[PDB]
Amino acid sequence: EPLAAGAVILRRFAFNAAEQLIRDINDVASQSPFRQMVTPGGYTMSVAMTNCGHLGWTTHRQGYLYSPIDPQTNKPWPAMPQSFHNLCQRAATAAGYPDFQPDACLINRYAPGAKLCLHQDKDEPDLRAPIVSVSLGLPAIFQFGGLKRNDPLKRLLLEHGDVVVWGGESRLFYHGIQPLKAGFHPLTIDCRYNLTFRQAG
DNA sequence: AGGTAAAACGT
DNA sequence: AACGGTATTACCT
Ligand SMILES: O=C(O)CCC(=O)C(=O)O
Ligand SMILES: [Mn+2]
């Protein structure tokens, strides 16, 4: 369990809820489809993304931001599914964050080779609130460091149903995903999904 | 006067 | 391929 101060991995926590979560990913994506976002610097991200809930993480020319509106559809992001919110609440409570109320869920899709380079989650104004991160499908190596980029990384395999929660002291810690290895999973076929819940408003 | 982009090539 | 440069710079608010 003990990843860092205020950080924990709940292994296979979402395993039982996974089938329903995956159906709801498909429902969300049918309204706001997965898209590979382009950085301010002009590079297309390997991870395909969408959002649900009140606020969605996005890139544009000027930087990163949380928007109530999907810039692709010009409609609000789909409502956060009850299955998402219920799972998130249970995970956060188990992790020691019983008062967490997310208003934002970023949905990441990793094809073979897709990565997410070391970054901080910092576009949220209320830093008191934790991050809840659900793994679905193919396994990936999760990097978890410290407050500085060059702080040593813990490398952890995240498997289908694993939930990682950080906050408090570890809230602004650098973290990332190494290039996804190809493979098969009975529920996702050829990809990894990640659900990242935050308080963005 | 701060916050931010790099959530993205060489050794 | 793990590690670290780049952003002690050029930009908007
Ligand atoms: O895919 C993951 O496990 C991490 C996702 C992430 O870091 C993010 O969406 O900010
Ligand atoms: Mn992140």
Distance between CA atoms of A58 and A20, rounded to whole angstroms? 25
Taking the CA of residue A149 and the C1' sugar atom of nucleotide B9, their distance in angstroms comes to 17
Protein-contacted positions of strand B (CB under 7 Å): 4-8
Handedness of CA A2, A89, A120, A27 (dihedral sign): positive
- Ligand 1 binding pocket (C-beta < 6 A) is A 106, 108, 116, 121, 133, 135, 142, 175, 177, 194, 196
Question: Cβ(A34)–Cβ(A87) under 8 Å?
Answer: no
The CA angle A67-A70-A74, to the nearest 5 degrees, is: 120
Please give the structure tokens belonging to residue A140.
Answer: 């990936």
Experiment type: X-ray
Please give the structure tokens belonging to residue A61.
Answer: 């020319």
From the CA of A107, the nearest ligand is: 1
Helices (DSSP H) in A2-126: which residue ranges? Answer: 18-29, 82-94
Question: Cβ(A88)–Cβ(A196) under 8 Å?
Answer: no
Q: Is the CB of A120 under 7 A from strand B?
A: yes
Protein-contacted positions of strand C (CB under 7 Å): 2-7, 13
Rg (CA), chain A: 15
Distance A183 CA to ligand 2 centre (A): 24
Q: List the strands of the sheet with A44-52, edge to edge.
A: A2-4, A7-10, A163-166, A131-137, A192-198, A104-110, A44-52, A35-38
Q: Is the CB of A150 under 7 A from strand C?
A: yes
Domains in chain A: boundaries? 1-201
- The one-character DSSP state at A45 is E
Options 1.10.3720.10, 2.40.50.140, 2.40.50.180, 2.60.120.590; CATH for A1-201 is 2.60.120.590
For this experimental structure, what is the resolution in angstroms?
Answer: 1.9
Please state at what angle helix A18-29 crosses helix A82-94, rounded to 10 degrees.
130
Please give the structure tokens belonging to residue A53.
Answer: 């809930």
